[PDB]
Amino acid sequence: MRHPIPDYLASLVTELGAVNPGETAQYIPVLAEADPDRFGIALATPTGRLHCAGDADVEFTIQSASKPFTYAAALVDRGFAAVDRQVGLNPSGEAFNELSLEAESHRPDNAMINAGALAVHQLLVGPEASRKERLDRAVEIMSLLAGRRLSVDWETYESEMAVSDRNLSLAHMLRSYGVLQDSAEEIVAGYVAQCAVLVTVKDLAVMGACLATGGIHPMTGERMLPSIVARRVVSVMTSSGMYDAAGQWLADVGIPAKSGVAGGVLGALPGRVGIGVFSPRLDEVGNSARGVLACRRLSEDFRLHLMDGDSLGGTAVRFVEREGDRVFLHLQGVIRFGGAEAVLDALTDLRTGAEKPGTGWDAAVYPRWQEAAADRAALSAATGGGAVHEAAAAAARDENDGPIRTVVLNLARVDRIDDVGRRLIAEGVRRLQADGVRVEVEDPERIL
Amino acid sequence: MRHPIPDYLASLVTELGAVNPGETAQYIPVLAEADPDRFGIALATPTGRLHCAGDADVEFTIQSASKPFTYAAALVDRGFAAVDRQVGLNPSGEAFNELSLEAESHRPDNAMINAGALAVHQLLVGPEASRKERLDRAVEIMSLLAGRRLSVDWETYESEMAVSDRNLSLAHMLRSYGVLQDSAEEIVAGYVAQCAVLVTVKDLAVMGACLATGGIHPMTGERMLPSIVARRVVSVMTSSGMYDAAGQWLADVGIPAKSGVAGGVLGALPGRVGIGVFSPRLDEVGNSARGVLACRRLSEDFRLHLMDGDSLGGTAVRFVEREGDRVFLHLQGVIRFGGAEAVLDALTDLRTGAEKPGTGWDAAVYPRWQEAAADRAALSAATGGGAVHEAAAAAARDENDGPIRTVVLNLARVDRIDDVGRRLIAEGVRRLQADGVRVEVEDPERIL
Q1: Which reaction is this enzyme known to catalyze (chains A, B) (predicted)?
Q2: Which of A382, A407, B80, B380 has the lowest tally of Cβ within 10 angstroms?
Q3: One of A13, A30, A66, A67 is an active-site residue; which one?
């Protein structure tokens, strides 16, 4: 059987391809002359799958969509403190206002706008880094997430340098306020080479998935970035990626994205998918007309929206077996706060102490809450509490004949657990034992 | 054993309670005179749990934290088109600029700022609604999510009406541009009564959980709001809740929130938790000083951040049994796009047709991707692919002796599935059958 997603994308490529409004970036003939009759799209999943359609293998310069990756590299190289002194986190339009550096911050609003990107490139390797090392670092970071060595289209680069007065303007102003240390020319050349890196819709989809997973490359499972860094980058993409239209975009689409003037659009939805879209023509605000509409379609059709919750929750608890004197608690999935919390609930739902729980709420005041609580299993399926409810059941009628002396924690089905989950679950175990309960943690591949 | 979360909150209440900077809302003596030595916090989970600490049972007027609930009610009553004509989705500071209505929109920036809230209240029941019905509707919506009948503190209301010149200013300007139809006085009285509704930290935590779950009340499992409406509301809380500091707040905290001048702060993290915080004193920008810091602490300590992905993913697939000729595929959790997608992958990972799959990528170009793909199980645990990999295994060495004639889909462990998931999974089944494979869907409580 053939995967239905790629077909959906094919349908999408045909439908939205019925028209092709807007126009190509006019500033450089290399872009103004590029074939406008191209439209490709790719989805890279968290687990390592890649569904695509249309011109998804056609190369184009990444331009502004490079901004979150260099921002990423800079944060890893210099740390948060050093980057935050030079780059803010405030959303703004690309139009430059000097007042934005006159603030006691003395720094560009954010990493998505040009002035902010120029400051990022400057911080790329270290204070004593050479022009060549910073570019290589830019190209490297994008290449490591793309999974293949990328190249700089020097034809576009040259075309761009011949008309880089605006960026030179930004860089000079920035030097003026001490945000840039090196020459305006040097930093602009580096940022322009950076924007000339060649990628395909597929490359972007994969690169976006690395951010979407929290820094893990979906095709290898190797950590390419710290989860904290990926988080920051996706944060700024969401609040600043679409400049002054970021709010409207957050509400109608909900997909952290950033587009480039060559027709490319990058997306990254935490825990769900990396997206690459390509369509040469841009709308009135400078974004890829179809690329942007393709993202709105994916969101509405699949409910792929940042605000549409999708957590493991109680499903962290595979099941609860009250074999007899001993209780078996198996866990599964990617355990973080959500799952850890549910686990702690299952453990507490066992009578391993004088059961004098604090209902949290007054049954007298909330009769409905009591009624709903009665049908433990129904209430769980309506919210989504996996098998956590099986704990209260084990500590139910079965307690009527025999206490609980042993609890076995099986983690075989658990893929991985973050620190928060590890600390919460560990404490849970520590507190169970304190109840005179024996606790054995069966953990084949030492994950705890 | 005692639940570790409430203790963590207790620790948090004690630590941050070491100091109490800022000051109480000075505009009305009722608020300027309120005891500042109070600090409470509550967390309401998706499954129906409630962890709290400190003064979490103390009532205070909800003020601005009422804005997302009335916005919610208005969207349900009038529909999106009618509300969007009057209320925008653009982030802005509370400072009012007339230019914001001179735009061809002719509407306030968003529902989180006063002018935007006045427009929302006006739309509350319908065009022919009376003053009393709109207030009742406001009080009702907040009451249905809180789970108990709430009351308007008329003492605060009176205190406020005596100094409502600013809001009267807004309402009058809004009437000027036709955003309000009724009198400035009438709408301001309604909005002020609205802000005087009494709630506790716990009430807010529960109310926020309803939004966090997509509209489902965590204590009953009853749908209180459409998922689309809850989505919009949380979208605007994130982009506009903290006005011009929304970007910075999105990055350092990542919790959709809105605070009120009485010390209350409401939070709502999709798929994870509802939050109520209370601390009378406000900082320089008007938010609850400790309430705001409490949210930053919860985010950093538990990694409770909108951009920190937490999905079911491959865990939607409980397991894959290749008993013999027949294959058993059990699903679980809250199946949406993420889980549905993984399911479709499992199905495709079975050879039920001439296996001429499109790797998506060239093995020659990506040697590392091939290597990682080889150890199917390792790669899955590194990204988090639950049991989807068990499908390729069933279609592995076992195919070497016998094809696959029957596939059994068990949904017993699945809590619920949205439309997107239902359409994707249904198509998967439709396409399996087309391969001459028998497919039986064991679904006890008809969920499909």
Answers
A1: L-glutamine + H2O = L-glutamate + NH4(+)
A2: B80
A3: A67
Provide the residue range defining the domain that includes A391. 310-448
CA distance A35 to A16: 17
A312, A329 contact by CB (below 8 A): no
CB A95 within 8 A of CB A46: no
Experimentally, how was this structure solved? X-ray
Single-letter amino acid code for the residue at B208: G
Closest to A352 (Cα-Cα) out of A389, A385, A394: A394
Final residue of a structural domain among A265, A291, A309 = A309
Query: Backbone dihedral region of B403: left (phi > 0), alpha (psi from -120 to 50 degrees) or beta?
Result: beta
Q: Are residue B249 and residue B319 in the same domain, yes or no?
A: no
**Alpha helix (H) residue ranges in A196-226:** 201-212
For residues B259 and B281, membership in a common domain is answered with yes
Specify whether A321 is located in the same domain as A288.
Answer: no
**CB environment A341-361: b (16+ within 10 A), e (fewer):** bbbbbbbbbbbbbeeeeeebb
The resolution of the experimental structure, rounded to one decimal in Å, is 2.5
Q: Report CA-CA distances (Å) from B29 to A238, B157, B199.
A: 40, 12, 20
Closest CA to B414 of B311, B333, B312, B315: B333
Report the 10 Å Cβ neighbour count for A283.
16
Residue with tokens 């205070």: B60
Say how many C-beta atoms besides its own lie within 10 A of residue B239's C-beta. 27
B243 is in an annotated binding site: yes
One of B71, B179, B243, B429 is an active-site residue; which one? B243
Instruction: Give the pairing of strands A326-335 and B198-199.
Output: unpaired
Scan residues 173-232 of A and list those with Cβ closer than 8 Å to B.
Answer: 202, 212-214, 216, 218-222, 227, 231-232
Looking at residue A63, what DSSP letter applies?
A: G
CA distances, B146 to each of A259, B47, B126, B211 (Å): 41, 15, 24, 11
CA atoms within 13 A on the CB side of B148: 18
Dig out the tokens for A402 from the structure.
Answer: 């025999």
* Among candidate residues B362, B348, B341, the one with its CA nearest the CA of residue B417: B341
- Tokens at A275, concatenated: 């997206």
